[PDB]
Amino acid sequence: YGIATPKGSSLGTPVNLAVLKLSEQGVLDKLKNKWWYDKGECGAKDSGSKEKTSALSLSNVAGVFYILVGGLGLAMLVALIEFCY
């Protein structure tokens, strides 16, 4: 993008030079960070990185641990009726 001035306009070159001054001083990138990231509604959705995990998930293995302790508890329930009979 750019700023436009009429051909042969007085303020043509002064504005052109004034844009290079704002860029090197970092005023343009600072203003870009203002209305985009700072005042943005998803400032948190720009820091978390999603990468390819190497290891195997713990959630799928949880389904096996919840069916094991579910058997250990059911086992101790049958241990008491066999001790009385």
């Binding site: 993008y1 700023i3 436009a4 009429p6 051909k7 999603k50």
Partner: protein, 50 residues
């Protein structure tokens, strides 16, 4: 357009996201690019893990 209101005198300067094209460079004076950009890809990032 905004380029029209510069060649026809209804305004003195146009400050906006104005794409620097050749057909516009022949009629008005463009400054240096104050913001670089290009055509990109927008995809809805999954949101797939279940």
């Amino acid at each position: 357009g905004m380029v029209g209101e510069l060649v026809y005198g209804k305004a003195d300067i146009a400050i906006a996201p104005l794409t620097i094209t050749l057909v516009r460079e022949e009629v008005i004076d463009f400054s240096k690019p104050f913001m670089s950009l290009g055509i990109s890809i927008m995809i809805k990032k999954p949101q797939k893990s279940k």
